[PDB]
Amino acid sequence: TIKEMPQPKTFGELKNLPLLNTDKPVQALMKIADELGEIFKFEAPGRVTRYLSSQRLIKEACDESRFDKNLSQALKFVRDFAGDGLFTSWTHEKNWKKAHNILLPSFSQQAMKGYHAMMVDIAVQLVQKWERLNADEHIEVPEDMTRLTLDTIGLCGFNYRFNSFYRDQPHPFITSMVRALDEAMNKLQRANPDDPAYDENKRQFQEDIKVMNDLVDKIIADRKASQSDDLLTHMLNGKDPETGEPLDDENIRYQIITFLIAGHETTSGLLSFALYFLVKNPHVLQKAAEEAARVLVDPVPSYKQVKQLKYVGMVLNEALRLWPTAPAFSLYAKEDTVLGGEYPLEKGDELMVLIPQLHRDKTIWGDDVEEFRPERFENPSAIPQHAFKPFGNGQRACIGQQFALHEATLVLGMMLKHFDFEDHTNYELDIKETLTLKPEGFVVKAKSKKIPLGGI
Numbered sequence: 001t002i003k004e005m006p007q008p009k010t011f012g013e014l015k016n017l018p019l020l021n022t023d024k025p026v027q028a029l030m031k032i033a034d035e036l037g038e039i040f041k042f043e044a045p046g047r048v049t050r051y052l053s054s055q056r057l058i059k060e061a062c063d064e065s066r067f068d069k070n071l072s073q074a075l076k077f078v079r080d081f082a083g084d085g086l087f088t089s090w091t092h093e094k095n096w097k098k099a100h101n102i103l104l105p106s107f108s109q110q111a112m113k114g115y116h117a118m119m120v121d122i123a124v125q126l127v128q129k130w131e132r133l134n135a136d137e138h139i140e141v142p143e144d145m146t147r148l149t150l151d152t153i154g155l156c157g158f159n160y161r162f163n164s165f166y167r168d169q170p171h172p173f174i175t176s177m178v179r180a181l182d183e184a185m186n187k188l189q190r191a192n193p194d195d196p197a198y199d200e201n202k203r204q205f206q207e208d209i210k211v212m213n214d215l216v217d218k219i220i221a222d223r224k225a226s227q228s229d230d231l232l233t234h235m236l237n238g239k240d241p242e243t244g245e246p247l248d249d250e251n252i253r254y255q256i257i258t259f260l261i262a263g264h265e266t267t268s269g270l271l272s273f274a275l276y277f278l279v280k281n282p283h284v285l286q287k288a289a290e291e292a293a294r295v296l297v298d299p300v301p302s303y304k305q306v307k308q309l310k311y312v313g314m315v316l317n318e319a320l321r322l323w324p325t326a327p328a329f330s331l332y333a334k335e336d337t338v339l340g341g342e343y344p345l346e347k348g349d350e351l352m353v354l355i356p357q358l359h360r361d362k363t364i365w366g367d368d369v370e371e372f373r374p375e376r377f378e379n380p381s382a383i384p385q386h387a388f389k390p391f392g393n394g395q396r397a398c399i400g401q402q403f404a405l406h407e408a409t410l411v412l413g414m415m416l417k418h419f420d421f422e423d424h425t426n427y428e429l430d431i432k433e434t435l436t437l438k439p440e441g442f443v444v445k446a447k448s449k450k451i452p453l454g455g456i
Ligand code: HEM
Pocket: 069, 086, 087, 088, 100, 153, 258, 259, 262, 263, 264, 266, 267, 270, 324, 325, 326, 328, 329, 330, 389, 390, 391, 392, 393, 395, 396, 397, 398, 399, 400, 401, 403, 404, 405
């Protein structure tokens, strides 16, 4: 028998919309899920969606024969600048499968081995920056992780140096990207987006989109005036084996913007949360540091050595369990269907997967879901299907998962090998939201173990 779906408090004609009028919407939705359960309806004028938090219902949502990727309102706003790039295209648009086929080779094992040296280049810059700090100084963690991740996707993917470690202020592309993501997030609660009160928001949004595109212009120009075989090489020259066609210029521009953003923001968040959890759990930090010291025996890490940092990998997966940095994904019903044998859906109905909640399902993980325990991932293959989804689902899953994890494992391994870390301010977790999640104001002090770093 069908069941009435729980729903949060309403605001008259605005329904639930005002619940999104907060600078921390995902965290607000997590609290609503804690109060209402595995599923709740969320209505706004002219639209409805249903938020899923349990593995038993999410496993159904992840059945590709019944549901396909949907562009949530957030992705529709991001599409204003990411167009039909891979992250914001519908599965049925020609450019999705075409770009997917052309770019998948850029994330093969062979490609990853080829990216390794450039990843080390930026990682060494991070380690040198910290080695060079004076006794009285400290590290702004998310800031430096963003310097590291943006520079890494820039160099490995486009042979372009953002030179973020040569700047004391965030890189211009970052300032505009963050403002654009913040606008998309703030636009979620706007009942009347065309009210003149938002003209300055619109003007600033166009300005930020222009800055990102001006950068894309530079990357394209520098490649033209430059022999590489990287992500950009495939975007410019690769042919889809199905159609035999290469991407057109417009889509290429969207892919560059897409990869510069998806290719670093969430990885900066991951590294930031991983270091946060490590300093808050001394015993776990000790285990991870022991592995880094034992495994990374050379001046700089080799590809094989990074693959051997098992515990560091577990630490990263546990950080993704608690705070998956792209916290949700959306789906739509391909045909009428019944969810969990109790909730009838009509073709087209939308669902939102609240990843942080899925990852706190006590019926899967046990009651200690709030504890940071990397050991949960000792044998990742044994976790029930669809219980852990920080990288999305099926054919629309993250194309750069291995890239992100290789980069994060390498850098965290080097960090743990070279410094002892101190949470000198007893930092209180404050998670800033820009659709994606990242600690804000997280600072630490790093005391060098004075171990020489090898040449790049
Ligand atoms: C730990 C860091 C990362 C996390 C948590 C993450 C998470 C995700 C998630 C959840 C999706 C699916 C979104 C949806 O269904 O709406 C996704 C898609 C995607 N990600 Fe990642 N990602 C990460 C790093 C990266 C990196 C480093 C790259 C580029 C090298 C990347 C490129 C993409 C692209 C292009 C897609 C769209 C794939 C497609 O639909 O064809 N991601 N990612």
